[PDB]
Design a protein around this ligand. Structure first.
Ligand SMILES: Nc1nc2c(ncn2[C@@H]2O[C@H](COP(=O)(O)OP(=O)(O)OP(=O)(O)O)[C@@H](O)[C@H]2O)c(=O)[nH]1
Ligand SMILES: Nc1ncnc2c1ncn2[C@@H]1O[C@H](COP(=O)(O)OP(=O)(O)CP(=O)(O)O)[C@@H](O)[C@H]1O
Ligand SMILES: Nc1nc2c(ncn2[C@@H]2O[C@H](COP(=O)(O)OP(=O)(O)O)[C@@H](O)[C@H]2O)c(=O)[nH]1
Ligand SMILES: COc1ccc(C=C2c3ccccc3C(=O)c3ccccc32)cc1O
Ligand SMILES: [Ca+2]
Ligand SMILES: [Mg+2]
Ligand SMILES: [Mg+2]
Lengths: 54, 334, 437, 427
């Protein structure tokens, strides 16, 4: 019903129609997560090479 | 070879359907959580409609209409009727009702309670049955959940011999094309104890539930009169038929209720598909004027009618989508 | 004028990025060699299209875009493709071996050895900006790179560009074109880690696009090319307000303002119409009322769901072609009385409308026919939560047996992150439930 | 992503030589190592298996190993014997006498370093080595013993590379010696730990197929290898040719292996054909799909109905309706959804390749990770125990330094593997 905020230009136009009214982690922590996961990989690989060494 | 699943064990109707399906030797029941199904006889609560119609290479069908609860819940049915222009506040086949929350339209209800009292006309209502507003509001707040207050039909039609109260149960099947099918066989859930106009305390002749009644089995087997007998009584006692005096109104009410919510629940262009069996409870006053009481989304059938109705469901609602290698239904055209 | 940088991660991101930028060039009349004859301000300017294209003294218009994939195969086709001259080497980044459909491998293992390079190549674009708005990130949910590396990138951008907005164009997994069995794992994992870092995300379910191509373009087996050219049209409709003169959604902040009242619930549903086959001999052009009505058909949505059984928080209509406000309002009034459109009680029941008189451009030799008027509706409805429900269910089935989990644990990820991600998703489904019912 | 091929022992070299012979024809490569094809599809992913020399000469990235020169001299004198890099011929003289201990601990330990020097020389040429593939038998001594020794030492030097194997299982129906169950049991112990993917090629299955289906009265090792070479060509199709999913062993492993130890696949193939006998009628897609799932078409003598499929990979070759493929594949799953685990959604994936194998207008290769594979290991375990309960023929092994405990341990691990498969069959 109510058309408002009609804005017109050469490219087109825009408006709003209403039918009814209403009723972060730091660089430190990130580098910590990545390196911590890298350590777990190193540990897993070391356990393998140790197992293979046996 | 089609496939289906069962997720409602307590369903007497569809326990029989799954039986019939298996007996064709062209349907295979799968486990509960097997997603690769053609048909789903889903649960009553928290049915996962969102997970339907996303299996490539499978046409999927479910035995429930999403959003049909708005019709099959007493609090919702009132709101639906009052807000929908199709039914309107002026609806003549639905009793005057109001939505009441425990400590909403309580002030609105009292405004009508006054005209009844300041008019010296019938002023009995129902949630228990009472003629005093205070006795009712004190009962709702004592229960906990939301209740609906409704005008009590003080002048119901009474079967003879017995001076008995009764209600009518009609079974309606809506398929995937939203064809509205009325089961030709209905049943009158009667009271055996004579209707008492003065004493509302005794709720044994006011409430006609099959459980409460179970004078049980005096006049007919199990307090259940079918249409052939009821039709005969109307002819002998009132010089009319079930078709003319009542069934036209019933078909009108059913048609109107389902047409109202069609755009909200229709699965015409959906990725999955729905059908559903409903149970409409009707009430007849002394002037042969039909009133809608409520709608059941998960209705049980009558023992005699299980075999015929359940088979009917397979024919028009299931086999119509999944065909295999005169009609008991009356099509309410629209 | 404020610039926008487009980031394309993984196979899906890159190949969709190619479709979009191809289309962009055709809409602005830019040639494969980057020359734009209509641009009379040689070597610079602050026009609307400069939001996406920077300029060189030689008169070349280059995309403000970076392509990144942990495998060289896909981007190599950009290096040697028809628009090879458009981008320059520093924009096209490639690794040696991919993430192997593994989130943990893309995020932790391989992500760590290339993240600094990527951010540096991004920083080089940002330095060429006078006023950076933010980023548009294209990626898949299912891919190891698209899921794993994206989330890591999104985390760092929030650190290096804290004041900048970040939008997503995300491909939701569909078995009909799925490449991995563990895509639900990757989807939940990247969604959990990216959620706090994304201001607004447009999900496209490959299932929806696949069936739209089959149903409306009569393509029996849609290829990625078929899917992507259709997606690029939708993406174009969404970003057109950033590239052309207008007053609606003129910057990235306005997307969150107009579509996302609640931060976590920042997944607007896109619905596009009309989709018509180019090899359709005889076609009757559709009207404003007809295409606007199609915006409420699930068969036209980017995600198959039922908005009737949910609640709207916001709704924008974006028209392109022969359209005027009068016909739009007439179409809305009619639709309102025929369809179920429930808004949340704390939002006005209304529509923000944007019209561009230039009709949608079609790729020569493409599958889409030229139309006189098209529309893309952006509605934030709780019904899109059905997609989260589907996805979390598949996640639960596999994780209950810890199937495939060892692949992620082997890349340095903890098994706890699975349950932590799933819990965050369980909360998300709850948020949608509170708002919607 | 380059793959380094290795073939060990008599069986390993004979199926290995046959494998290169088949795919060399598919890629247009002749015995000289020169290309003579008509499609660029043939050369797009040929780097995966072939090294390119000057003058555009294609040489297999293959290493031939044995503890005796007999079989390798036959290869070198075979049809495509000249294509192989002569330096990649690494062989001993003593043999292994069908003894796992000799191949793994004594005779093979003396030769293994020489092999790893050739592996290292090949790997250093690779732009980005993705992994290895081994062809060998488990019933002998060299392929079984030294082959698994190689795998262990390759897993010590390239621990982040994929190890794949085509392992021929022994069978009394096609037996050379009685100690095959010993050699096989000892080898399975190794494969469970040190491979990502193992294609179980059962000689019992290959025999039954040749006898029952192909109606060959007396099948030879040549007949058996016609089935193997056809299967090996199929399972490596997506690795060797352009397609939707982009050619690498890790993505196969990730999607096929829900649990690390359960990585023993059942190969299948359709249509089943015998040597020389040309078929004139191409199979319809419904026929390819039906047959490739039939137990009669499985290369591992296990009944798939006795177990459940964890994951499945299917590759159709030839000019066909990829839509019809989709429907038929979806039909199988939707018809027999009980034989697929429900806790791995969409565990069946399919790919298509335009290029068909030689002699067929179209074909279908099956790669299944079924829990029914336990039947294979139970069979070997029963044969193992029948002898081991009396310590029969054990002196062949203790004479090489082995102890009875190592047999008891190998026996225990395979029985564990069996029970692990059984755990997920009743999930
Ligand atoms: N719409 C569309 N989806 C795609 C396209 N390419 C891949 N996908 C989807 O992306 C998902 C897999 O992610 P990819 O982008 O292919 O993989 P990636 O991002 O490169 O990550 P990795 O290869 O595992 O390292 C699958 O579900 C595909 O369906 C594309 O071009 N268009
Ligand atoms: N407003 C009214 N006026 C007259 N009778 C009424 C009435 N409201 C209810 N009743 C009488 O109500 C009895 C029981 O309750 P109601 O109809 O709400 O059943 P439930 O027990 O709520 C539905 P059903 O058991 O059929 O699923 C009706 O069947 C009828 O006997
Ligand atoms: N399929 C096939 N199996 C073989 C062949 N030669 C031997 N075998 C099997 O391999 C086992 C013997 O191993 P073999 O390769 O001869 O021992 P090795 O040379 O010391 O490795 C037995 O179980 C045989 O059935 C062959 O050419 N083809
Ligand atoms: C069981 O789920 C999956 C199993 C395997 C794959 C990928 C593969 C695969 C991946 C890379 C290379 C080769 C292969 C194949 O040759 C193959 C053949 C048919 C179908 C899938 C696959 C992808 C999946 O999603
Ligand atoms: Ca300019
Ligand atoms: Mg990739
Ligand atoms: Mg031998």
């Amino acid at each position: 019903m109510e058309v408002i905020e009609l804005n017109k230009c050469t490219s087109g136009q825009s408006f709003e129609v209403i039918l009814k009214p209403p009723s972060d982690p730091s660089l430190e922590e990130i580098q910590k997560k990545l390196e911590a996961a890298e350590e777990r990989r190193k540990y897993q690989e070391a356990e393998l090479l140790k197992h293979l060494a046996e | 070879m089609y496939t289906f699943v069962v997720r409602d064990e307590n369903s007497s109707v569809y326990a029989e359907v799954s039986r019939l399906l298996l007996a064709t030797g062209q349907w295979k029941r799968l486990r509960k959580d097997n997603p690769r199904f053609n048909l789903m006889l889903g649960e009553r609560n928290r049915l996962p409609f969102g997970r339907l119609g996303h299996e490539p290479g499978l046409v999927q069908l479910v035995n429930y209409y999403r959003g049909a609860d708005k019709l099959c819940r007493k609090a919702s049915l009132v709101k639906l009727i009052k807000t929908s222009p199709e039914l309107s506040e002026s609806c003549t086949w639905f009793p005057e009702s109001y939505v009441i929350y425990p400590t909403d339209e309580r002030e609105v209800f009292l405004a009508a309670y006054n005209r009844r009292r300041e008019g010296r006309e019938g002023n009995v209502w129902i949630a228990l049955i009472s003629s005093e507003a205070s006795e009712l509001l004190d009962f709702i707040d004592e229960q906990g959940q939301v209740h609906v207050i409704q005008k009590y039909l003080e002048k119901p039609l009474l079967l003879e011999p017995g001076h008995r109260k009764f209600d009518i149960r009609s079974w309606v099947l809506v398929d995937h094309l939203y064809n509205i099918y009325l089961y030709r066989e209905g049943v009158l859930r009667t009271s055996s104890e004579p209707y008492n106009s003065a004493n509302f305390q005794d709720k044994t002749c006011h409430l006609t539930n099959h459980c409460i009644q179970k004078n049980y089995g005096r006049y007919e087997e199990g307090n259940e009169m079918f249409f052939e007998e009821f039709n005969q009584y109307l002819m002998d006692a009132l010089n009319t038929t079930l078709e003319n005096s009542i069934l036209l109104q019933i078909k009108h009410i059913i048609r109107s209720c389902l047409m109202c919510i069609e755009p909200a629940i229709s699965t015409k262009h959906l990725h999955y598909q729905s059908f559903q069996l409903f149970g409409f409870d009707f009430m007849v006053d002394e002037e042969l004027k039909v009133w809608l009481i409520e709608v059941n989304g998960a209705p049980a059938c009558a023992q005699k009618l299980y075999a015929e109705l359940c088979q009917g469901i397979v024919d028009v609602a299931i086999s119509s989508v999944f065909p295999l290698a005169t009609s008991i239904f009356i099509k309410l055209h629209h | 004028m404020r610039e926008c940088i487009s980031i394309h991660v993984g196979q899906a991101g890159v190949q969709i990025g190619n479709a979009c930028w191809e289309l962009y060039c055709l809409e602005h009349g830019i040639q494969p060699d980057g020359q734009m004859p209509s641009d009379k301000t040689i070597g610079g300017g602050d026009d609307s299209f400069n939001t996406f294209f920077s300029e060189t003294g030689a008169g070349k218009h280059v995309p403000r875009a970076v392509f990144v994939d942990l495998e060289p195969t896909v981007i190599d086709e950009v290096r040697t493709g028809t628009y090879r001259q458009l981008f320059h080497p520093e924009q096209l980044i490639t690794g040696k071996e991919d993430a192997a459909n593994n989130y943990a491998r893309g995020h932790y293992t391989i992500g760590k050895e290339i993240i600094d390079l990527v951010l540096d190549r991004i920083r080089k674009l940002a330095d060429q900006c006078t006023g950076l708005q933010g980023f548009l990130v294209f990626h898949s949910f299912g891919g190891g790179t698209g899921s794993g590396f994206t989330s890591l990138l999104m985390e760092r951008l929030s650190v290096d560009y804290g004041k900048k907005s970040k939008l997503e164009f995300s491909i939701y997994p569909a078995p009909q074109v799925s490449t991995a069995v563990v895509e639900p794992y990757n989807s939940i994992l990247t969604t959990h880690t990216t959620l706090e870092h994304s201001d607004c995300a447009f999900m496209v379910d490959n299932e929806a696009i696949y069936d739209i191509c089959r149903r409306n373009l009569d393509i029996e087996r849609p290829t990625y090319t078929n899917l992507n050219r259709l997606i690029s049209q939708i993406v174009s409709s969404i970003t057109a307000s950033l590239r052309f003169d207008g007053a609606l959604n003129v910057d990235l902040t306005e997307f969150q303002t107009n579509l996302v009242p609640y931060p976590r619930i920042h997944f607007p549903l896109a619905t596009y119409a009309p989709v018509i086959s180019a090899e359709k001999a005889y076609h009757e052009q559709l009207s404003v009322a007809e295409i606007t009505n199609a915006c409420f058909e699930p068969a036209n949505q980017m995600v198959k769901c039922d908005p009737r059984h949910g609640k709207y928080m916001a709704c924008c209509l974006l028209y392109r072609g022969d359209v005027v406000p009068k016909d739009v309002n007439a179409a809305i009034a009619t639709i309102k009385t025929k369809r179920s459109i429930q808004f949340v009680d704390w939002c006005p029941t209304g529509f923000k409308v944007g019209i561009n008189y230039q009709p949608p451009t079609v790729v020569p030799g493409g599958d889409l026919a030229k139309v006189q008027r098209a529309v893309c509706m952006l509605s934030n409805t709780t019904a899109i939560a059905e997609a989260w429900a589907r996805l979390d269910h598949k996640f639960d089935l596999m994780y209950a047996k810890r199937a495939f989990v060892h692949w992620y644990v082997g890349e340095g990820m903890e098994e706890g992150e699975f349950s932590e991600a799933r819990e965050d998703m369980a909360a998300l489904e709850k948020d949608y439930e509170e708002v919607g019912v | 992503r380059e793959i380094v091929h290795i073939q060990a022992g008599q069986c390993g070299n004979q199926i290995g030589a046959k494998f290169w012979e088949v795919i060399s024809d598919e890629h247009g490569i002749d015995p000289t190592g020169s290309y003579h094809g008509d499609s660029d599809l043939q050369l797009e992913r040929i780097n995966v298996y072939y090294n390119e020399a000057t003058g555009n000469k294609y040489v297999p990235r293959a290493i031939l190993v044995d503890l005796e020169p007999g079989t390798m001299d036959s290869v070198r004198s075979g049809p495509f014997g000249q294509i192989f890099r002569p330096d990649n011929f690494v062989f001993g003289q003593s043999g292994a006498g069908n003894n796992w201990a000799k191949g793994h601990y004594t005779e093979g330990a003396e030769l293994v370093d020489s092999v790893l020097d050739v592996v290292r020389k090949e790997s250093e040429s690779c732009d980005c080595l993705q992994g290895f593939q081994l062809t060998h038998s488990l019933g002998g001594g060299t392929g079984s013993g030294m082959g698994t020794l190689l795998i262990s030492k390759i897993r010590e030097e390239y621990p982040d590379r994929i190890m794949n194997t085509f392992s021929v299982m022994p069978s009394p129906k096609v037996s050379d010696t009685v100690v095959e169950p010993y050699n096989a049991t000892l080898s399975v112990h190794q494969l469970v730990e040190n491979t990502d993917e193992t294609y179980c090629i059962d000689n019992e299955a290959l025999y039954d197929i040749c006898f029952r289906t192909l109606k060959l009265t007396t099948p030879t090792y040549g007949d058996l290898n016609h089935l193997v070479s056809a299967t090996m060509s199929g399972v490596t199709t997506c690795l060797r040719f352009p397609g939707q999913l982009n050619a690498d062993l890790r993505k196969l492993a990730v999607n096929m292996v829900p649990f690390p130890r359960l990585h023993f696949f059942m190969p299948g193939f359709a249509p089943l054909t015998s040597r020389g006998s040309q078929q004139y009628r191409a199979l319809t897609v419904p026929e390819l799909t039906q047959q490739m799932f039939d137990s009669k078409n499985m290369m591992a003598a296990c009944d798939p109905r006795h177990g459940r499929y964890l994951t499945v990979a299917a590759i159709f070759r030839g000019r066909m309706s990829m839509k019809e493929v989709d429907e038929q594949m979806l039909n199988v799953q939707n018809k027999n959804s009980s034989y697929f685990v429900e806790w791995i959604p969409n565990n069946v994936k399919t790919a298509v390749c335009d290029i068909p194998p030689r002699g067929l207008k179209m074909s279908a290769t099956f790669i299944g990770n079924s829990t029914a594979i336990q039947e294979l290991f139970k069979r070997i375990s029963e044969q193992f125990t029948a002898m081991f309960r009396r310590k029969a023929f054990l002196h062949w092994y203790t004479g090489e330094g082995m102890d009875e405990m190592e047999f008891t341990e190998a026996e225990s691990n395979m029985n564990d593997l069996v029970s692990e498969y059984q755990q997920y069959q009743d999930a």
